[PDB]
Amino acid sequence: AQRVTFRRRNPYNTRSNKIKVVKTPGGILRAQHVKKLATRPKCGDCGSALQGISTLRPRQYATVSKTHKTVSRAYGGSRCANCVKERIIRAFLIEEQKIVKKVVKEQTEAAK
Amino acid sequence: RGRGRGRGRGRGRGRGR
Amino acid sequence: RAHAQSKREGRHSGYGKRKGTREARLPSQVVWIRRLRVLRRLLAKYRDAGKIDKHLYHVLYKESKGNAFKHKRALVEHIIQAKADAQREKALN
Amino acid sequence: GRVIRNQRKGAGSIFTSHTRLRQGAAKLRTLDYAERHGYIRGIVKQIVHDSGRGAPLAKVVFRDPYKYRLREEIFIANEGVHTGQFIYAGKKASLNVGNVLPLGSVPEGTIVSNVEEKPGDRGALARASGNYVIIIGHNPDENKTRVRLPSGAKKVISSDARGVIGVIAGGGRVDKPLLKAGRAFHKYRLKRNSWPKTRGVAMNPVDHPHGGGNHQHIGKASTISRGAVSGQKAGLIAARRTGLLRGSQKTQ
Amino acid sequence: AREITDIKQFLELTRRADVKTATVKINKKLNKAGKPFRQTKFKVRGSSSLYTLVINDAGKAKKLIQSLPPTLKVNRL
Amino acid sequence: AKRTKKVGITGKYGVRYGSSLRRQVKKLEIQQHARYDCSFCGKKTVKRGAAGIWTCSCCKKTVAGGAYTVSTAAAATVRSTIRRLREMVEA
RNA sequence: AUGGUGAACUAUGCCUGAAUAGGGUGAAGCCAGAGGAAACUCUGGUGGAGGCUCGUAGCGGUUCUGACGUGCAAAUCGAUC
RNA sequence: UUCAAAUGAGAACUUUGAAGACUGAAGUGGGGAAAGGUUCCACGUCAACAGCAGUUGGACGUGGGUUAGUCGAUCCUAAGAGAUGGGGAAGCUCCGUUUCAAAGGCCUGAUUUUAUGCAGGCCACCAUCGAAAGGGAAUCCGGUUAAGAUUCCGGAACCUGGAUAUGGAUUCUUCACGGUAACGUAACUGAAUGUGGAGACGUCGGCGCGAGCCCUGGGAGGAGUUAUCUUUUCUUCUUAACAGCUUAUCACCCCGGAAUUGGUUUAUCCGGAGAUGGGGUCUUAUGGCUGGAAGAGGCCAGCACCUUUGCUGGCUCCGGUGCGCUUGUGACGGCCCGUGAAAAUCCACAGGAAGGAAUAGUUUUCAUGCCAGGUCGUACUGAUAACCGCAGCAGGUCUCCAAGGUGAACAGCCUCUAGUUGAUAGAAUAAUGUAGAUAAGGGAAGUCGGCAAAAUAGAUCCGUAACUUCGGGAUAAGGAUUGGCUCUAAGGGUCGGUACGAUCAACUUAGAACUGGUACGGACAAGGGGAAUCUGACUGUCUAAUUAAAACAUAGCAUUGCGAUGGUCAGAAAGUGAUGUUGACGCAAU
Ligand SMILES: [Zn+2]
């Protein structure tokens, strides 16, 4: 049966003026301004949120340690950990294909 | 001026023809 | 508190005290949601307890989805009936 | 009198295009050394919808031949182009859907779209959804190629102009009726302020040459001469015939 | 606003050359279901955070008080 | 139970817009909401969104096609008249 | 006629935000059952579609040609819509 | 509105107490934006003002009051605005915003003449202005004033910028290990350049979860009622930012190889492109425990006593419930010829340029320690008296918080918290009025005209025509039932087993007796209907302040112009523009 007011000068229900009702140690209801929630980082080509990376605001990523923003595997904090393994098959097979196509070209001018 | 003092336009009042 | 105590016994609930529709007082979707969540939960715990097999569970999951099982007591009578005729066929074949 | 409605559209105050949600200018890759002596490979990265357009756009990424970077161009997606497909642009490209070739090397009867008028303008002809041109003849001398335009005109352009093989996706869009003014309100909400349109016969004489009178009628002939004056051109300008034709449709 | 569970690490914080004020708080609590007991809380004020150590045994409560250095100002209750 | 006799998906429009205009939309609204087989993964997971764009539910392949159909009949002849003309270049 | 001032009211476009109880009707998709040689057709549910509908806040201003008409008001008040 | 007292020369109007009432929480409550500018607070005053009065006042006179590294501005960019280079114009000035321009400085190396000349390489982005509702580094709790606070005080935190030190870690295999894997850790060199992510997004629908509120049980205190009854009614029992550990839907990994197809949502999607199952990984919105933190705050008791006024004891506990209300969020589904901003900023990866150990070095992305954080706004009203309307005007003006009962309901009605009792009064009850009502018999005979008024009204059950674009018409039309009380039946959760009990918690529906002055949606609330004609298809829009319509618009249909050296239109001119970030399924004109 207790009502509460805004704690700042903004009187409108914008996206940056969310309110959570919090019971204080004084025994009364009081509003608390909450921040906009962070979004998990996404992979560069598959669109899924890669795991092992903390979900924070971009400028508070410079305060957390190194281990919260990367994975020990190469292309750690950029790819989907199946995106890495997909471009290894492609990098190994094409270069193996590019050298067996070079010896097929050699077959032409050496026997015509 | 206001809604009163009507003399001009009229349905069947003054200022006809 | 005295008026709410009499409503638990069934008083003050006749046709002269209803001003909204039957769907307005209690939606039909909530009754249907309550019906499936009892039938699906009972049917899932019978598969885990060994009282029913996965082939009979699959044909009862879809049967309970449409109709013919209006409460839990109707489903357990069909399960026993579907298990009683299953053992007489095996004993004769 | 008063300045009539179509004269006010040239000032460009409230009649300008709404270009907030547009993805950019859909232009072909600029003509460089690689596209007139060989070909270059590009990847279809993402196909997206363009606001105010009926045909979707395609994000195609090429490699810069002179510096280590990536260049993303804005193409008009043809029907059949999918993501992850290799796009070959240049003089020595093959005849596949989505490839960009000079139209002086394609055979007669090729279905191409996004055709340059002059070599270097990065696509001028056949850009709407479901539209295409057909190469009808080749002149090896003077490097001139004859094509047919979607309106049926038979133009001749240079053989060095480029064009994307295939037909533009999103065809058959105008086949569905809108069924209401609400769907027509949203269609023109992202193009320009030109809807709804008030008839000129139902307005005042100051607002239109057709206005006025005790009955809703034009009064004079609705066919306006070509050498008229801005303010008089309201109706059928330089019409050579009128009425509905009870006969065959557009000629060959 | 930080809790310390090690008593050997607690003694190192009292000789950090910057802590000047320490407080001991006696709390009247009770056990699982029976008699009340005496809970103590040793709080050391640092330069960026307040470290505290809670001992639920009265036998070790008195022993830790004499182990504190005398240059540290202890505030009883 | 079949709820409606002939209106089908156009029963949301009520008694408005006329019967003939509601029948042409019914022919195109069924096609634009139907599911289609993916040529790459073989699954019937292609759905329409942002007309002219046909995305596979899984398989992440996005194919540009017609406004209400994946492959229009006017574009199928285009896909065959270029394949026929391509074979004459090398042969 | 000459030279200046105004879109704080209002007209329209754009940009960035905000606001809109509770009911009625029951479109596609889906499930189960029944009939039939087939084609398929019916029955019971599910689902929640609409420039749909009743009706608050809101917006509007039909009628009483009511009140007022040197008014509370140079356009308001009441019922009704 | 009433009574009494106080003050005063003077009281229907001031103050206090008592009584009766209202606003009923979409408020006459508590806060803000725009706007006002001292109206805020105290003391003194009553000539004028408060259309009566006045001891009172938003009045008059004299003073007091607004405290920030964390709240905003400042910064970024949107629609746009607008210098320079140039081109027009007699000219005031106009065009144009990266445009026909020789458009600029960063990490450093070289230098121990002194401060930066000078050697590379790099990057061509090329003014600036534009949001106190967009984007955005970082604070909470308690106490405090006559009037101020997230700003003061006390306690407890966090961010940015800059210095360096101590401890740790790594290095003689120079620039770390473990896990099959997803990945994990207190740390664990990375320049030019390139790439990616966050910032960064529509609406509606149901479902899951969380928070606050509502409801409720036991217990520990206080208050109310008591002719009678009532283990009764009311009230108190609270835990911030931040820190550590832990915790889930989704997602992913390993083993394994599925038809006698299985799994599974309220809503039918998934599986040899590897399901079910078994074992794991990660995100930490949120929740849980602990620290912060009882030392606070709250509720009482026992004392002191003109007094600065305190002092001493206690308790502050353990639970339950949900189609509940508000709100946050998660995974989904529907809709589009509508697919629903940008930039500053921050991070990661790719890359291997450089710099480095052995009697010694490197990392301030590990821990701790040090210093600093400027300028301006901050009072009050935000409206039947502080804003705009000539005013202390029944008008107009954006938004947040939302108790209990009745009921479908944020409807109407009553009450709690909170706030008002302010609109000149007194005495009588003629006519005529304004507002609200009731009428015997007839039932539109009234009137241009059923104008006005009346009747109908909720829910449940029955029944429902012509016509039709087959979707409707339809709540068609037309009937019946409705209270109270006593019962019956049906619809669930949790626990030990290859069978059944025990226990616990919900308002939903149906049925049967009894009962009454035949009343029962008992106040409130709440469709008149049918048969046809003219006309416009419908939703929608306009003459602010006499005309809301058959007028306008609309989808549909048709015609015309135009292939860019172009169509239509603008400008005094222009190296000028709109359509055009456009290309005939287009634009422009009817
Ligand atoms: Zn696929």
mmCIF file of N, CA and C (backbone and C1' of nucleotides) in Angstrom, chain F residues 4-7 14-19 22 33 40-41 43 45 48 50 68, chain H residues 269-273 334-339 469-472 537-538 555-556:
data_model
loop_
_atom_site.group_PDB
_atom_site.id
_atom_site.type_symbol
_atom_site.label_atom_id
_atom_site.label_comp_id
_atom_site.label_asym_id
_atom_site.label_seq_id
_atom_site.Cartn_x
_atom_site.Cartn_y
_atom_site.Cartn_z
ATOM 1 N N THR F 4 -14.340 -24.103 -42.246
ATOM 2 C CA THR F 4 -14.871 -23.286 -43.325
ATOM 3 C C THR F 4 -14.964 -24.097 -44.611
ATOM 4 N N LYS F 5 -15.912 -23.711 -45.466
ATOM 5 C CA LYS F 5 -16.162 -24.469 -46.686
ATOM 6 C C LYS F 5 -15.174 -24.097 -47.786
ATOM 7 N N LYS F 6 -15.090 -22.809 -48.129
ATOM 8 C CA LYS F 6 -14.286 -22.404 -49.276
ATOM 9 C C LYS F 6 -13.387 -21.196 -49.049
ATOM 10 N N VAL F 7 -13.585 -20.401 -47.997
ATOM 11 C CA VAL F 7 -12.755 -19.213 -47.813
ATOM 12 C C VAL F 7 -11.327 -19.594 -47.434
ATOM 13 N N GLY F 14 -13.314 -11.470 -43.206
ATOM 14 C CA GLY F 14 -14.738 -11.271 -42.979
ATOM 15 C C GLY F 14 -15.507 -11.223 -44.279
ATOM 16 N N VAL F 15 -16.465 -10.302 -44.356
ATOM 17 C CA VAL F 15 -17.335 -10.152 -45.515
ATOM 18 C C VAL F 15 -16.886 -9.007 -46.412
ATOM 19 N N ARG F 16 -15.674 -8.503 -46.220
ATOM 20 C CA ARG F 16 -15.216 -7.311 -46.916
ATOM 21 C C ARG F 16 -14.424 -7.673 -48.171
ATOM 22 N N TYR F 17 -14.146 -6.645 -48.975
ATOM 23 C CA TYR F 17 -13.225 -6.635 -50.111
ATOM 24 C C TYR F 17 -13.705 -7.456 -51.303
ATOM 25 N N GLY F 18 -14.858 -8.102 -51.221
ATOM 26 C CA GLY F 18 -15.354 -8.829 -52.380
ATOM 27 C C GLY F 18 -14.838 -10.253 -52.438
ATOM 28 N N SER F 19 -15.612 -11.108 -53.109
ATOM 29 C CA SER F 19 -15.248 -12.516 -53.219
ATOM 30 C C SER F 19 -14.130 -12.750 -54.228
ATOM 31 N N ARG F 22 -10.773 -11.605 -52.808
ATOM 32 C CA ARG F 22 -10.367 -12.507 -51.740
ATOM 33 C C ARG F 22 -9.937 -13.873 -52.254
ATOM 34 N N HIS F 33 3.060 -18.756 -47.323
ATOM 35 C CA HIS F 33 3.161 -19.304 -45.978
ATOM 36 C C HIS F 33 3.442 -20.799 -45.966
ATOM 37 N N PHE F 40 19.750 -27.748 -50.682
ATOM 38 C CA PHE F 40 21.079 -28.058 -50.171
ATOM 39 C C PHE F 40 21.053 -29.144 -49.100
ATOM 40 N N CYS F 41 20.168 -29.018 -48.111
ATOM 41 C CA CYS F 41 20.127 -29.949 -46.994
ATOM 42 C C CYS F 41 19.014 -30.982 -47.103
ATOM 43 N N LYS F 43 15.909 -30.810 -46.381
ATOM 44 C CA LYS F 43 14.849 -30.695 -45.393
ATOM 45 C C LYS F 43 13.820 -29.660 -45.828
ATOM 46 N N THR F 45 12.372 -27.003 -44.787
ATOM 47 C CA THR F 45 12.544 -25.970 -43.774
ATOM 48 C C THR F 45 12.623 -24.564 -44.360
ATOM 49 N N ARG F 48 9.185 -18.202 -45.916
ATOM 50 C CA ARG F 48 9.267 -16.858 -46.467
ATOM 51 C C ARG F 48 9.385 -15.811 -45.368
ATOM 52 N N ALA F 50 10.420 -11.343 -45.488
ATOM 53 C CA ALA F 50 10.903 -10.193 -46.250
ATOM 54 C C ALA F 50 10.904 -10.500 -47.743
ATOM 55 N N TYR F 68 6.275 -14.520 -53.658
ATOM 56 C CA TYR F 68 5.427 -15.467 -52.950
ATOM 57 C C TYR F 68 5.787 -16.922 -53.219
ATOM 58 P P C H 269 5.323 -27.830 -37.270
ATOM 59 O "O5'" C H 269 6.843 -28.293 -37.358
ATOM 60 C "C5'" C H 269 7.891 -27.378 -37.077
ATOM 61 C "C4'" C H 269 8.734 -27.822 -35.908
ATOM 62 C "C3'" C H 269 9.846 -28.810 -36.210
ATOM 63 O "O3'" C H 269 10.986 -28.201 -36.790
ATOM 64 C "C1'" C H 269 8.707 -29.470 -34.244
ATOM 65 P P C H 270 11.911 -29.031 -37.809
ATOM 66 O "O5'" C H 270 12.729 -30.019 -36.864
ATOM 67 C "C5'" C H 270 13.585 -29.513 -35.851
ATOM 68 C "C4'" C H 270 14.100 -30.614 -34.960
ATOM 69 C "C3'" C H 270 14.686 -31.823 -35.666
ATOM 70 O "O3'" C H 270 16.005 -31.607 -36.131
ATOM 71 C "C1'" C H 270 13.249 -32.541 -33.932
ATOM 72 P P G H 271 16.468 -32.225 -37.540
ATOM 73 O "O5'" G H 271 16.897 -33.713 -37.175
ATOM 74 C "C5'" G H 271 17.882 -33.958 -36.183
ATOM 75 C "C4'" G H 271 17.980 -35.423 -35.847
ATOM 76 C "C3'" G H 271 17.956 -36.384 -37.022
ATOM 77 O "O3'" G H 271 19.205 -36.479 -37.681
ATOM 78 C "C1'" G H 271 16.522 -37.177 -35.317
ATOM 79 P P G H 272 19.283 -36.429 -39.284
ATOM 80 O "O5'" G H 272 20.550 -37.329 -39.626
ATOM 81 C "C5'" G H 272 20.708 -38.608 -39.021
ATOM 82 C "C4'" G H 272 21.982 -39.286 -39.457
ATOM 83 C "C3'" G H 272 22.070 -39.607 -40.945
ATOM 84 O "O3'" G H 272 23.431 -39.537 -41.366
ATOM 85 C "C1'" G H 272 22.144 -41.616 -39.700
ATOM 86 P P A H 273 23.880 -38.466 -42.477
ATOM 87 O "O5'" A H 273 23.842 -37.072 -41.709
ATOM 88 C "C5'" A H 273 24.716 -36.811 -40.614
ATOM 89 C "C4'" A H 273 24.709 -35.352 -40.223
ATOM 90 C "C3'" A H 273 23.419 -34.854 -39.574
ATOM 91 O "O3'" A H 273 23.730 -33.837 -38.622
ATOM 92 C "C1'" A H 273 23.816 -33.641 -41.561
ATOM 93 P P G H 334 4.747 -18.940 -37.118
ATOM 94 O "O5'" G H 334 3.661 -17.774 -37.097
ATOM 95 C "C5'" G H 334 2.277 -18.076 -37.018
ATOM 96 C "C4'" G H 334 1.447 -16.837 -36.796
ATOM 97 C "C3'" G H 334 1.654 -15.705 -37.787
ATOM 98 O "O3'" G H 334 0.967 -15.908 -39.010
ATOM 99 C "C1'" G H 334 1.625 -14.836 -35.589
ATOM 100 P P C H 335 1.654 -15.485 -40.399
ATOM 101 O "O5'" C H 335 1.561 -13.895 -40.405
ATOM 102 C "C5'" C H 335 0.302 -13.241 -40.363
ATOM 103 C "C4'" C H 335 0.459 -11.750 -40.203
ATOM 104 C "C3'" C H 335 1.404 -11.072 -41.181
ATOM 105 O "O3'" C H 335 0.807 -10.829 -42.443
ATOM 106 C "C1'" C H 335 1.839 -10.296 -38.987
ATOM 107 P P C H 336 1.341 -11.596 -43.750
ATOM 108 O "O5'" C H 336 2.108 -10.467 -44.571
ATOM 109 C "C5'" C H 336 1.419 -9.321 -45.047
ATOM 110 C "C4'" C H 336 2.278 -8.085 -44.959
ATOM 111 C "C3'" C H 336 3.598 -8.130 -45.715
ATOM 112 O "O3'" C H 336 3.447 -7.809 -47.089
ATOM 113 C "C1'" C H 336 3.924 -7.228 -43.533
ATOM 114 P P C H 337 3.177 -8.955 -48.183
ATOM 115 O "O5'" C H 337 3.637 -8.289 -49.555
ATOM 116 C "C5'" C H 337 5.013 -8.248 -49.922
ATOM 117 C "C4'" C H 337 5.464 -6.859 -50.308
ATOM 118 C "C3'" C H 337 5.011 -5.728 -49.383
ATOM 119 O "O3'" C H 337 6.050 -4.758 -49.277
ATOM 120 C "C1'" C H 337 4.286 -5.288 -51.588
ATOM 121 P P G H 338 6.932 -4.669 -47.938
ATOM 122 O "O5'" G H 338 6.059 -3.762 -46.961
ATOM 123 C "C5'" G H 338 6.203 -2.346 -46.957
ATOM 124 C "C4'" G H 338 6.659 -1.831 -45.613
ATOM 125 C "C3'" G H 338 7.549 -2.784 -44.814
ATOM 126 O "O3'" G H 338 8.528 -2.036 -44.097
ATOM 127 C "C1'" G H 338 5.616 -2.260 -43.556
ATOM 128 P P U H 339 10.087 -2.368 -44.290
ATOM 129 O "O5'" U H 339 10.334 -3.614 -43.331
ATOM 130 C "C5'" U H 339 10.583 -3.423 -41.944
ATOM 131 C "C4'" U H 339 11.454 -4.513 -41.369
ATOM 132 C "C3'" U H 339 12.719 -4.837 -42.159
ATOM 133 O "O3'" U H 339 13.773 -5.164 -41.255
ATOM 134 C "C1'" U H 339 11.367 -6.777 -41.984
ATOM 135 P P U H 469 -23.823 -14.459 -53.271
ATOM 136 O "O5'" U H 469 -22.390 -14.498 -52.579
ATOM 137 C "C5'" U H 469 -21.280 -15.113 -53.223
ATOM 138 C "C4'" U H 469 -19.966 -14.522 -52.770
ATOM 139 C "C3'" U H 469 -19.689 -14.605 -51.269
ATOM 140 O "O3'" U H 469 -18.292 -14.808 -51.052
ATOM 141 C "C1'" U H 469 -19.685 -12.338 -51.955
ATOM 142 P P C H 470 -17.687 -16.297 -50.967
ATOM 143 O "O5'" C H 470 -18.506 -16.987 -49.787
ATOM 144 C "C5'" C H 470 -18.103 -16.830 -48.431
ATOM 145 C "C4'" C H 470 -18.860 -17.748 -47.498
ATOM 146 C "C3'" C H 470 -18.595 -19.242 -47.671
ATOM 147 O "O3'" C H 470 -18.671 -19.879 -46.395
ATOM 148 C "C1'" C H 470 -20.893 -18.808 -47.990
ATOM 149 P P G H 471 -17.378 -20.593 -45.764
ATOM 150 O "O5'" G H 471 -16.779 -19.503 -44.767
ATOM 151 C "C5'" G H 471 -17.612 -18.803 -43.855
ATOM 152 C "C4'" G H 471 -17.043 -17.445 -43.529
ATOM 153 C "C3'" G H 471 -17.879 -16.566 -42.611
ATOM 154 O "O3'" G H 471 -17.717 -16.884 -41.239
ATOM 155 C "C1'" G H 471 -17.105 -15.298 -44.464
ATOM 156 P P G H 472 -18.898 -16.580 -40.192
ATOM 157 O "O5'" G H 472 -18.915 -14.990 -40.082
ATOM 158 C "C5'" G H 472 -20.048 -14.303 -39.571
ATOM 159 C "C4'" G H 472 -20.612 -13.346 -40.590
ATOM 160 C "C3'" G H 472 -21.912 -12.652 -40.212
ATOM 161 O "O3'" G H 472 -21.716 -11.524 -39.376
ATOM 162 C "C1'" G H 472 -22.098 -13.522 -42.396
ATOM 163 P P A H 537 -19.351 4.674 -53.881
ATOM 164 O "O5'" A H 537 -19.545 3.237 -53.218
ATOM 165 C "C5'" A H 537 -18.770 2.830 -52.098
ATOM 166 C "C4'" A H 537 -19.494 1.784 -51.287
ATOM 167 C "C3'" A H 537 -19.104 1.677 -49.822
ATOM 168 O "O3'" A H 537 -19.696 2.670 -49.002
ATOM 169 C "C1'" A H 537 -19.132 -0.473 -50.757
ATOM 170 P P C H 538 -18.795 3.459 -47.929
ATOM 171 O "O5'" C H 538 -18.314 2.325 -46.916
ATOM 172 C "C5'" C H 538 -19.253 1.612 -46.126
ATOM 173 C "C4'" C H 538 -18.628 0.424 -45.439
ATOM 174 C "C3'" C H 538 -17.602 0.732 -44.361
ATOM 175 O "O3'" C H 538 -18.187 1.105 -43.126
ATOM 176 C "C1'" C H 538 -16.774 -0.973 -45.768
ATOM 177 P P A H 555 -6.135 2.808 -53.168
ATOM 178 O "O5'" A H 555 -5.715 1.311 -53.509
ATOM 179 C "C5'" A H 555 -5.420 0.383 -52.475
ATOM 180 C "C4'" A H 555 -6.448 -0.718 -52.423
ATOM 181 C "C3'" A H 555 -6.797 -1.355 -53.760
ATOM 182 O "O3'" A H 555 -5.870 -2.354 -54.149
ATOM 183 C "C1'" A H 555 -8.786 -0.835 -52.580
ATOM 184 P P G H 556 -5.189 -2.308 -55.603
ATOM 185 O "O5'" G H 556 -6.374 -2.694 -56.594
ATOM 186 C "C5'" G H 556 -7.077 -3.918 -56.446
ATOM 187 C "C4'" G H 556 -8.410 -3.874 -57.148
ATOM 188 C "C3'" G H 556 -8.371 -3.517 -58.624
ATOM 189 O "O3'" G H 556 -8.024 -4.611 -59.455
ATOM 190 C "C1'" G H 556 -10.033 -2.232 -57.561
#
